Nucleic acid binder design. Structure first.
Ligand code: MG
Lengths: 319, 96, 124, 434, 513, 40, 128
RNA sequence: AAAAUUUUAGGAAUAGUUAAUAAUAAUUUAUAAUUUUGAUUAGAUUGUUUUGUUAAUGCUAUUAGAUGGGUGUGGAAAAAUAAAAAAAAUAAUUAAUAUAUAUCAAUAAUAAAUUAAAUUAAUCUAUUAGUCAGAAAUGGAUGCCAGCCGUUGCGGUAAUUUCUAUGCUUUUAAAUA
């Protein structure tokens, strides 16, 4: 058997440890680490009161977690916290890694971070997998998450029954650094399809089509179909026909998308030779940035439709 | 070897007259092609190779063929087996 | 996984979850890259679990590995020993039966000598 | 080989220079003798040296497993070292299981190729005269057992034919005399992809006069005549392979008539300026190079006044330089490799991509690849040990095919590069100009 | 019958030579018919095939059919390592049943081959991939004061001696285990970076308990076992009140580095500024142009400690984790036993005066005495060829060098000494250049598979690696004169083996009472 | 074919087969149920 | 999994032999010499003898003779208890014996103890 | 158990033998038995209105099989190896591949068969030749010679003639019906 240890408790860190306590019927030993010992004791008490089938341990430092667990899984809040916990700390998980350990990072970090984490784990002898999470916290509670694991192939085959305890769709992107890029490409496509749907419904209102409930039925059966087109169109109808109406706040925000989009331009090569080798990506990014600073950053992703013309403001005047 | 007794496709014993004793113990050549090369040196000078042939009598285009054989050996194309088979092949009285 | 030539446990990574295992027919098992006997065993176990028979069978690997080491031609769970060319001690160089040293084996052991010394001390 | 007993391991206990076997000790006891540098030869039976030959080659691969590219080149050097110590005597007819004229029983690989009645009556004497031409009784007091096995396989090619399947339709057989490397099942597959290429690209490309370089057994020459090329000419540096290939062209019917074989190093002569043989320009030049395990690894540059490369890269740069003088305009060259230069030597750059990108003398017109379907030995030099390809190398090998044309003939093939589904380079798109 | 198409010619009746069954039975060690006299000390190599090596064949490999008294051979088994999962009982289901016991041997090999198509970096596997998480929890137990690490290494020695032979008088075991590592640290004080080898038990960090009475399991979840190992494993008492150790028979061969005061790399070297002496004539090209030799690491310079790992209380099964070179020094009682047995068989079977020829295989009527003398001389040539003679202190014995790989099983008997070195790579030596000078100047291509060695009174413990797992079994019985005179291998082709190893030897009146 | 489940009586024997045909009474009862369903 | 058709019918239910493959090829002349030399190697016979064709073990008359001819391991009994051990094995340890001992016979062995070596012989009769 | 039907370019003898029998397991009796209406032996040899051809009761082909000393077991020796003939709990019975993939391993195409006309769907290519009425072919076979005359190895001489593919499955040469 293998001992498993989950590091970090936030809004997304708790249900992974809850599912690892539920589905592991005292076969794989569970250890819990957090940024504070009070939060780890709190989540251990929460796992204890609702029915715990496996014994779980609480630790305040990473050294006991390293010397006790074979598999370490991390679910932190930001990139810099995972960089501090994995590499920058004195009792680091990768710098003091045991040969044969398997360290999986579920945070959306840059490509160079996953590259240097894989390099330090390969020099220490361990195996580092980067598998950024995509999904809802309640979908994580129900056990539905999207994971794009990059790392070794046989190490990925060793981690499939552990990954199937809290995620349905777990795919192998290839070598390390390819898993953290898939979330960047996915959210870039999300932003581009949202901008395209906003522009298409703006042109639909410009052409004078009054029935949008039948327009989405044909637009879903065409070649220009997308899931974001199915998602945003009932809200975009009210945001177009009532432009004075403020958009409602959502769980996913403009800043939540731009936080992952802020990792992509640092992980991409230098664009200054041609100044724009990505037209619709920056065309969506400027509209999201114009929607952020105007006071609509925390609201829904359908707020791009009021700032479509504002995406042209950084193109006419900067050139 | 081909003139020794062998069973044919129908199983009956056939034997060619080459492995008989008159053509079996037959010497290779009849013409005086047995020649002496006293000295055959390959000297690598600066920027060139010099093949020295010191011998009393030579055959027609013998030196110009030995130079071609030595050039083919310099590129690494033969072995001892092919050289011995070429030397025991003897004289070929046909231009084509 | 009960058979040696049906490595069922080698293809845990060939399915994502329970429903994908239980919905795939033999053509989908063929395109996933599974050999014939293995995919036949997988499909038979799935169809037996669908009929109400869980996979409760004894693993016949070690028993067959025990029975393999003999020279049964049909693998019929028999025991056929190999007969070497020399099966008697006289033809392997040994001249006659070994005689035991009857004076060596009839000596009194060390505990018996110690108890005789203790008896000679305690009697007087 | 004639042994010198003064330079052996133990010249006092074994004054003949070798250790006779007598067929009693185990194979790993013989394998420890050969690893220490001692020669072994059979005393009474060929079965003792044949059991020592198979078991040593299996024990050496167990000690040096083929785990990467550098483990195969080391195993080939070790197996060539050990199999040279496994000797057999020159007078093999004095051994016990050579032939029995009364029971018609024999040991050796001649039972796989010949009949038991035909060997024990008449063919034991014809094989005795067959060894005398290549390995005489005077110059050799002992033979390597791999030389004895190759003499038995080449005696079958001398007696009966050798079918080239599935290259030749079941009735055209060649006779490689001795020292001419025949093709295995793996060696046939680069010529099977070429024969499918020539079946479709003859007539769209107007391929009439083909030239084959380094023919060897002549299997690449006969596959071109079968696909419809009227004029084929072969060039082989082995003179005995040239005489045998043109004799098999007469034996293979009347549809192999315009086939010619000359002796040349790589290309024909082209030295006489007054005889003008420059009027014979070929439109397709075929090259099927050999890829041995010692040939792919030691490729490096040599020469001060004439700096030349060695090995597989030096053979390619000979073919890539002199082919323009024998090609016609609007003509192509076809190269058939086996992707082992990229497997056995992954640190060095690609030698065919080094000609196109750097030298800029040839333009990549077409390139095909196909995975390897069969198993066996690959580019086997005849008098050496047999080494079949392991499973992990066989699933990575591919049958490649490179079709290149001249840099000066871009404007003729410009309408081939602008079709959909092709990859024209940056120099061809500048010369088309719509 | 079979449908055969008629031909107007004769039919070829091939009697073609197949792969011999006796050859693969002797290579795999499953022959059970070879009567081999003249017991020798040369090691025996056995290539493990699938389902061909068990306790039945390995018992005859230990005790051959000639009537031996002691397994006095080193037995190398290529690819014989097995991996066992822990077994557990299913409480749910239709009933109570125990599952999970299975062997991963002979199907999951060590060092999977890495072939790919695109000074130079190639891809290889030098460590065993299955037992590497088991190696990690042992190597992290010694990772870091220095005195605590020294007492950790002294507290974990196998049986108090750890394989090392040192004179210790008026001393208990717990002080002897400290004196041995004190002698090693005093010896390794002069070199900046040196190493030594010890036998150690499994630490408590590698053994975790499971609640169901109490079941201990390994940290990696895999147990290194040998399925063809005969007899019972060695039982060692836990001291802390004496109970048995849960995994005491599985030991470790630790290489420890000292301080004083999977990407191999290949490089092809060139040189700046009588070829075949065995061949009589002069050849235009050499028959063997290149040599291949195994590259071993450097031993630091050398009173001097013994540095020989000797297990006098158990039989040793070495499962290497890296490429090692083992130099076996033969004990004197084994070669004395083989010498007296061979000379007894010579004076019994060959009582003739032999005629006194020039050499053994001379021309003349091959009688039984000449066949026996030829077989004895070939055995002597095998012993002299595969061994070398070293010097010790006034002592000299045979030294057999054995190339051990990851995944093999090397059986070492009790009383056999061995030095262990690490194989670092593979070199290629040109034969024409080695005819004039040493082969160090004749190097053409060098593959370095081990890029290990870093460069950042007493000595300090730097690091600890495990090179092999030592499976220690209980000492196999030595037969007497009467037991070996009546020992027949044909009585042990089916059964009686576990009673041969449980009871002392075999019965003197077995199956003829 | 007679099914040998994992929860039958194990024969701890190194000279033969590792599992006997001795059932559990639950196995006897469910075999009787399947016998009746075949008997119809 | 039966040996009904692999070995002769007189080897039906046959267990516990040394090697039953010996007794299928006894009639071959090189194995017929090996059987008669083995009966001379076992002693007890004044003439050359082969065991019968339908027997794998030794016959009942022959193993009774070799058990009676076998010299006892204890030679030269000093104590009358050690003479009683030789009377115990001739009576209660004969070949294919039927009669069991008596608790009064154990009392006779427990009444002849003189030295502490006699208690090792007497208590092992108590264990039988 | 019975009837019944084979062949030899240079045609002759055969026998553990025929019948009777109070005879299993033949100590006897007999003028015994096969064969010129073709025997025994020797050669060839599974047979078979199944194949091919023709106007043809003609000619010509064949691959169902069996097996007195390996074991008296078994009802029956047919027993040293066969992709099913599913083999005593419904293992599975939707389908198509039903095998490679029972994937490594000494070993060689020597050899054994075979001869097209889809066996799942995720868009997108298929379709011999700038035709050769006969002109071409570094395409085969192939030498000869005296230089005033010694093992110097110059030249005529880049020798000349003789067989050819292909078109042209409208087809032409070879054998048989
Ligand atoms: Mg009468």
């Amino acid at each position: 058997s293998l001992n498993v240890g989950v590091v970090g408790m936030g809004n997304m860190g708790v249900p992974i440890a809850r599912n690892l306590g539920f589905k592991a019927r005292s076969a794989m030993y569970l250890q819990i680490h957090s940024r504070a010992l009070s939060k780890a004791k709190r989540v251990c008490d929460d796992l204890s009161v609702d029915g715990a089938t496996c014994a779980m341990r609480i630790h305040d430092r990473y050294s006991t977690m390293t010397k006790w667990c074979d598999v370490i899984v991390l679910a932190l809040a930001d990139v810099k916290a995972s960089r501090h916990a994995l590499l920058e700390d004195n009792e680091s998980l990768i710098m003091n890694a045991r040969k044969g350990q398997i360290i999986v990072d579920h945070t959306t970090v840059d490509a160079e971070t996953s590259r240097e984490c894989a390099h330090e784990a390969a020099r220490r002898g361990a195996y580092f997998l980067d598998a950024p999470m995509s999904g809802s916290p309640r979908a994580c509670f129900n056990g539905q998450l999207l994971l794009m694991v990059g790392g070794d192939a046989e190490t990925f085959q060793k981690m499939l029954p552990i990954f199937h305890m809290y995620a349905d769709n777990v795919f192998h992107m290839g070598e390390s650094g390819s898993g953290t890029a898939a979330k960047m490409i996915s959210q870039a496509l999300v932003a581009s399809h949202n901008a395209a749907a906003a522009e298409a419904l703006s042109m639909a209102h410009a052409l004078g089509i009054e029935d949008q409930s039948k327009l989405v039925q044909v637009l879903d059966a065409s070649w220009g179909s997308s899931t974001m087109l199915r998602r945003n169109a009932p809200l975009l109808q009210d945001l177009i026909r009532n432009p004075d109406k403020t958009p409602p706040t959502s769980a996913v925000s403009v800043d939540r998308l731009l936080s992952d989009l802020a990792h992509l331009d640092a992980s991409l090569p230098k664009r200054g030779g041609e100044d724009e080798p990505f037209p619709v990506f920056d065309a969506a990014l400027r509209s999201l940035a114009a929607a952020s600073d105007a006071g609509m950053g925390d609201r829904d992703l359908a707020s791009v439709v009021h700032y479509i013309e504002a995406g042209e403001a950084e193109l006419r005047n900067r050139t | 070897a081909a003139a020794l007794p062998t069973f044919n496709e129908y199983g009956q014993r056939v034997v060619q007259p080459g492995a008989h004793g008159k053509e079996y113990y037959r010497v290779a050549t009849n013409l005086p092609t047995v020649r002496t090369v006293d000295r055959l040196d390959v000297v690598r000078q600066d920027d060139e190779v010099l093949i020295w042939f010191v011998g009393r009598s030579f055959l027609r285009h013998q030196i110009r063929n030995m130079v071609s054989v030595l050039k083919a050996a310099g590129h690494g194309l033969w072995n001892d087996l092919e050289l011995q088979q070429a030397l025991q092949s003897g004289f070929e009285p046909s231009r084509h | 996984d009960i058979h040696r030539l049906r490595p069922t446990s080698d293809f845990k990574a060939s399915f994502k979850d329970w429903n994908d295992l239980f919905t795939c027919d033999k053509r989908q098992l063929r395109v996933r890259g599974i050999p014939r006997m293995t995919r036949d065993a997988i499909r038979t176990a799935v169809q037996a679990f669908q009929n109400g028979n869980p996979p409760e069978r004894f693993d016949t690997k070690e028993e067959w590995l025990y029975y393999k080491q003999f020279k049964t031609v049909d693998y019929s769970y028999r025991v056929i020993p190999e007969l070497p060319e020399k099966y008697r001690p006289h033809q392997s160089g040994i001249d006659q039966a070994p005689l035991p040293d009857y004076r060596e084996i009839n000596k009194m052991p060390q505990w018996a000598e110690c108890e005789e010394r203790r008896q000679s001390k305690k009697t007087v | 080989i004639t042994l010198r007993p003064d330079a052996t391991v133990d010249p006092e206990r074994y004054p003949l220079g070798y250790v006779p076997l007598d067929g009693s000790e185990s194979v790993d006891s013989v394998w420890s003798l050969v690893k220490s540098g001692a020669f072994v030869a059979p005393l009474s039976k060929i079965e003792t040296i044949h059991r020592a030959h198979v078991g040593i080659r299996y024990l050496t691969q167990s000690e040096y497993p083929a785990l990467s590219s550098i483990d195969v080149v080391g195993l080939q050097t070790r197996l060539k070292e050990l199999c040279s110590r496994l000797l057999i005597r020159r007078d093999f007819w004095v051994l016990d299981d050579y032939n029995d004229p009364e029971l018609n029983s024999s040991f050796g690989i001649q039972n796989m190729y010949f009949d038991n009645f035909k060997w024990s009556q008449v063919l034991w004497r014809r094989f005795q005269q067959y060894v005398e031409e290549y390995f005489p009784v005077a110059e050799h007091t002992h033979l390597t057992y791999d030389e004895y096995l190759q003499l038995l396989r080449s005696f079958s090619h001398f007696e009966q034919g050798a079918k080239l399947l599935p290259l030749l339709p079941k009735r055209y057989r060649i006779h490689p005399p001795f020292g001419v490397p025949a093709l295995s099942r793996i060696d046939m597959e680069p010529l099977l992809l070429y024969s499918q290429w020539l079946k479709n690209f003859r007539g769209p490309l107007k391929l009439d006069a083909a030239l084959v370089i380094r023919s060897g057994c002549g299997a690449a020459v006969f596959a071109t005549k079968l696909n419809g090329v009227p004029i084929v000419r072969g060039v082989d540096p082995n003179p005995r392979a040239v005489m045998s290939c043109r004799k098999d062209a007469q034996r293979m019917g009347r549809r192999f008539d315009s086939i010619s074989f000359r002796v040349g190093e790589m290309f024909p002569d082209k030295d006489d300026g007054n005889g003008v043989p420059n009027s014979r320009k070929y439109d397709i030049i075929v090259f099927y190079p050999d890829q041995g395990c010692y040939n792919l690894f030691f490729t490096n540059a040599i020469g001060e006044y004439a700096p030349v490369l060695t090995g597989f890269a030096g053979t390619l740069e000979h073919f890539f330089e002199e082919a323009g003088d024998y090609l016609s305009d609007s003509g192509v060259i076809v190269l058939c490799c086996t992707n082992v230069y990229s497997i056995l030597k992954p640190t060095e750059p690609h030698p065919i991509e080094y000609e196109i990108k750097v030298n800029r003398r040839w333009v990549l017109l077409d390139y095909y690849d196909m995975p390897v379907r069969g198993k066996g030995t690959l580019s086997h030099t005849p008098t050496d040990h047999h080494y079949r390809i392991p499973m992990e190398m066989r699933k990575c090998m591919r049958s490649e095919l490179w079709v290149l044309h001249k840099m000066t003939s871009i404007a003729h093939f410009a309408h081939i590069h602008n079709i959909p589904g092709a990859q024209p380079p940056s120099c061809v798109v500048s010369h088309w100009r719509n | 019958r079979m449908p055969r198409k008629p031909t107007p010619y004769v039919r070829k009746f091939l009697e073609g030579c197949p792969l011999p069954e006796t050859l693969v039975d002797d290579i795999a060690g499953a022959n059970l018919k070879s009567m081999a006299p003249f017991f020798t000390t040369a090691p025996r190599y056995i290539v493990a095939a699938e389902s061909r090596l068990s306790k039945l064949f390995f018992h005859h490999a230990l005790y051959p059919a000639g009537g031996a008294r002691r397994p006095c051979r080193v037995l190398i088994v290529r690819g014989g390592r097995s991996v066992r999962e822990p077994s557990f009982t299913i409480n749910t289901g239709g009933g109570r049943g125990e599952v999970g016991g299975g062997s991963r041997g002979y199907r999951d090999p060590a060092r999977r081959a890495y072939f790919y198509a695109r000074a130079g970096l190639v891809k290889r596997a030098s460590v065993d991939g299955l037992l590497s998480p088991l190696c990690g929890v042992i190597e992290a137990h010694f990772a870091v004061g220095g005195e605590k690490l020294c007492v950790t290494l002294a507290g974990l020695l196998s049986g108090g001696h750890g394989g090392l032979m040192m004179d210790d008088g008026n001393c208990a075991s717990n002080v002897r285990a400290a004196k041995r590592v004190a002698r090693l640290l005093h010896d390794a004080a002069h070199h900046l970076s040196s190493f030594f080898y010890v036998h150690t038990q499994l630490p408590d960090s590698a053994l975790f308990v499971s609640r169901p009475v109490a079941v201990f399991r390994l940290a990696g979840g895999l147990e290194p076992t040998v399925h063809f190992a005969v007899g019972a494993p060695l039982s060692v008492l836990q001291r802390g009140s004496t109970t048995v150790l849960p995994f005491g028979h599985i030991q470790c061969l630790l290489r420890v580095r000292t301080r004083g005061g999977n990407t191999p790399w290949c490089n092809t070297a060139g040189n700046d500024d009588i070829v075949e002496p065995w061949k009589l004539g002069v050849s235009l090209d050499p028959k063997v142009p290149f040599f291949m030799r195994t590259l071993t690491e450097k031993r630091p310079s050398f009173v001097h400690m013994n540095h020989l790992l000797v297990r006098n209380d158990c039989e040793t099964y070495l499962l290497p984790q890296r490429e090692l070179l083992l130099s076996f020094h033969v004990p004197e009682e084994a070669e004395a036993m083989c010498k007296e047995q061979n000379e007894e068989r010579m004076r019994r079977q060959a009582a003739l005066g032999y005629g006194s020829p020039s050499h053994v295989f001379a021309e003349g009527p091959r009688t039984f005495a000449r066949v026996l003398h030829g077989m004895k001389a070939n055995l002597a040539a095998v012993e002299e060829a595969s061994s070398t003679f070293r010097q010790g202190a006034s002592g000299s014995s045979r030294v057999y060098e054995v190339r051990a790989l990851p995944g093999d099983v090397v059986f070492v008997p009790r009383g056999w000494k061995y030095s262990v070195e690490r194989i670092v790579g593979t070199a290629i030596i040109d034969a024409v250049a080695a005819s004039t000078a040493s082969p160090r100047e004749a190097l053409r291509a060098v593959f370095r598979t081990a890029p290990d060695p870093p460069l950042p009174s007493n000595a300090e413990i730097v690091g600890v690696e495990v090179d092999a797992f030592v499976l220690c079994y209980k000492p196999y019985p030595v037969l007497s004169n009467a037991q070996a005179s009546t020992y027949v291998a044909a009585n042990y082709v089916h059964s009686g083996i576990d009673d041969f190893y449980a009871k002392g030897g075999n019965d003197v009146y077995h199956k003829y009472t | 074919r007679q099914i040998r489940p994992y929860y039958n009586l194990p024969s701890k024997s190194e000279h033969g087969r590792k599992m006997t045909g001795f059932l559990t009474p639950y196995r006897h009862w469910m075999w009787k149920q399947n016998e009746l369903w075949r008997n119809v | 999994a039966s040996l009904r058709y692999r070995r002769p019918y007189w080897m039906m239910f046959l267990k516990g032999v040394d090697n039953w493959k010996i007794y299928t090829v006894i009639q071959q002349p090189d194995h017929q010499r090996t059987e008669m030399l083995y009966q001379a190697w076992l002693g007890g016979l004044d003439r050359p003898y082969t065991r019968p064709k339908c027997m794998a073990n030794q016959p009942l008359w022959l193993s009774k003779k070799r058990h009676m001819l076998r010299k006892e391991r204890l030679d030269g009994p000093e104590t009358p208890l050690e003479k009683y051990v030789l009377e115990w094995h001739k009576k209660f340890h004969s070949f294919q014996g039927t009669e069991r001992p008596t608790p009064d016979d154990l009392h006779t062995a427990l009444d002849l103890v003189e030295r502490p070596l006699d208690l090792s012989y007497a208590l092992q009769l108590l264990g039988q």
